[model samples]
Target chain A: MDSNTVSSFQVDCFLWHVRKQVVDQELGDAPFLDRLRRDQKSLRGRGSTLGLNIEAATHVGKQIVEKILK
Target chain B: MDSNTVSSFQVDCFLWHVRKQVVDQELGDAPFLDRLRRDQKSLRGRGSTLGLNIEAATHVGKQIVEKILK
Candidate 1:
């Protein structure tokens, strides 16, 4: 397989993939959580190349729970 | 002022501004709610031209609440 690409733009893209492919899944799937294992590994490679010191997170944890309730 | 661009892509862009500009504002502003009055008007012009019939509201009320709690 090819390596990976990462940046804020990439982070932005993956976040949306989660939003579009995942949250949009609401009315549909929950595998987004499951998919993160893979995304994190990819992000490490992509993110490292990004060269910024990010005190970022791999999880927003409960923020997502708060986002989807009635 | 000039008119704006509208489409799913535009909707997608504004939604992210809300996510990036508004929700990200959790650490900052609340004017996003106020801004919607203008965003909706603009969206009406933008959306109608896009050929979609959306019950687009400048409001996501309780949904925003669901999105911001601990």
Candidate 2:
């Protein structure tokens, strides 16, 4: 079997990898803004397997993180 | 120097690479729906760095791609 085949559970392993390393990183005072404005824009524009609305996701992420920190 | 330092121009080179290959691919008659539904769900639950709302992003992406192909 190919190493990349989805299991019966149908989990996308690659996406899982990205989440832990990328999204969950700490953002400090700005929270997600630094990652969002810079990292996210680049990723989204390129070809993330995840179907994110780059702009909307960034806005929401910033808002969510800001609220959490407050 | 660490391999991951940000330059002043600070382009997220990783993201740029993803966009050119992943999102830009053609989906044929179905367009992005198949990839969005399967690939996105798997990616999101695992934790996307892109801050995408898995459900919302999937829904919106399907709608957008469907409309475009119509």
Candidate 3:
């Protein structure tokens, strides 16, 4: 877990697990994951982490995903 | 399930359930739930829903919570 990176294989995998369970439960999984994905993509939009808090935002998403898995 | 309402007993219950599980799992539950509560509070901060889209913002949160429960 690099302190600088936001999106990683582990994070993506966690999110995907949550998404699959959520969608299977028919609980608006598509909209939520889509929003999350968009938010992450926009954070690194400039192909740089020069002026953004990717780590901070990533933490929030990670929290949400972990909760879902629980 | 009122079309105009975002937070309800049902929604709150769902969130609480997810919170409990997530917190028990030590997945940064406190921070995540606090952020979620703040987000919801800010949505209705003006004591009115005149120009804001509570429904939309709420749907996103609902999705995340549901995913967590799954």
Candidate 4:
């Protein structure tokens, strides 16, 4: 199992939702902008089961946490 | 990290998208209906971070694969 009990994939999904929110808001320099950008990169896909490596998942999780904390 | 090199979280994210498709289609006995049902269960959230457990992520991944195959 992943070291993350919450499932990094969930974080990625959250990021996706957040991206739309950011765009929907139509603002510049969103707090989650950096990770939000990653959301698009994720679509390129890791080309595996879910299309992201554990490493990317880990990073994505941190991005989500930081966004949530804000 | 999760046994899944592709990051189960990614699977879950895919499941999220698939779920929208399933509902958007709105049908009885969809090929991935059982797993689709599970999609609702996942929203319950595993807690502790991303709102889902490794187990749920794993299941969500399979559900996505099955849905994609369909």
Candidate 5:
């Protein structure tokens, strides 16, 4: 059985809801802006299942945390 | 291995990101408002891993779809 723990897939799914808003609010000079902008487009272009790997999930989580901490 | 498909957990995680906003935007007269409001509080109270059941995920998905279709 799958453990009841947060997965990269779960984090990716959560980020999908907030990513566009976070991207829009982020400064152009932010270090992760370009990656997130690229990711935002890529995530939308996919058919389904973000296929989000751990590294990608980590970046997304960082951006969300950055937004939340601001 | 876990299949690359949507799951209740993923949907719930996605909803976790959007639920408060959705609850705020939904009309008091809306049929699902009370369930969602209760869920919003329950989700926030959990330590981690929402333990989201399929039924709850379905409701969240329906609300999000309804919001999107509006």
Candidate 6:
């Protein structure tokens, strides 16, 4: 796969696989996917690269990112 | 037990507690601990060790951490 495809797969795995299994399992499937979609849409406003980062942030959540970026 | 013993127990519990309750109380103690020490001491900064894979280039802020780490 190309870089873009690989990156996209990584985003999905991080969000749906790792996040669902590890972080906040209470999120459930629909809500988790919905949150991912929402975060992706937000990223689109910024740019594609950021869109991917935003997707990762969605799984990790905004709170953790704030600490690092700061 | 001495104050040090109790403080040590709290730090241990804060680092690992089921369902986030022990962790919750530990966070609640932050203000009190800060007051007693009279310094801006904190464990919150260590949250960065948890994770923060973001995409954007926005001005980083506590909000990100609050969102993820919270």
Which candidate leads the pack in lDDT?
Answer: 4
Q: What are the chain B TM-scores of all models?
A: 0.36, 0.34, 0.33, 0.36, 0.33, 0.25
Assess each prediction's global lDDT (C-alpha) against the native. 0.38, 0.32, 0.45, 0.46, 0.41, 0.32
Tell me how candidate 6 scores on lDDT: 0.32
**Per-candidate alpha-carbon RMSD to the true structure:** 11.9, 17.0, 9.1, 16.6, 17.1, 17.3
Interface RMSD of each: 11.9, 14.1, 7.6, 15.7, 16.0, 17.5
Poorly placed runs, candidate 3 (over 4 Å): A1-16, A24-33, A39-70, B1-16, B24-30, B39-70
Clashing pairs in 1: A66-B66
Which of candidates 3 and 5 reaches a greater TM-score? 3
Q: Would you give the TM-score of chain B in model 3?
A: 0.33
Candidate 5 — which residues are off by over 4 angstroms? Answer: A1-6, A26-31, A41-70, B1-70
TM per candidate: 0.29, 0.22, 0.29, 0.26, 0.24, 0.21
Tell me the spans in candidate 4 whose CA falls farther than 4 Å from its real position. Answer: A1-6, A30-37, A43-70, B1-70
Model 6, A1-70: lDDT tens digits are 2443333333333333333332243322343346446744644553364444545635543333223234
Question: Local error of candidate 6 at B64, Å?
Answer: 11
| Model 2, span B1-70: residue lDDT tens | 2212211011122222232233343211233236445634445443355444444544443343233323
DockQ score for candidate 6: 0.03
| Model 6 CA deviation exceeding 4 Å by range | A18-24, A27-70, B1-70
**What does candidate 1's lDDT look like per residue over B1-70, in tens digits?**
1111222323343344444442343422233344445556765664466654444422332233224221
Best by DockQ: 3
lDDT per residue for candidate 4 within A1-70, as digits (tens), equals 3333234454445435544443454432333355457755654352145545555665665564444433
> What's the distance in Å from true for residue B10, model 6?
32
**Model 5: DockQ against the native?**
0.02
Which 10-residue window in model 4 chain B sums to the lowest lDDT? B22-31
lDDT of 3 by residue, A1-70 (tens): 3332333322333444444455454554343446546745644662254443545554565675554645
Candidate 5, B7-35: lDDT as tens digits: 33333434444433433433123323554
Q: How many residue pairs clash in model 5?
A: 0
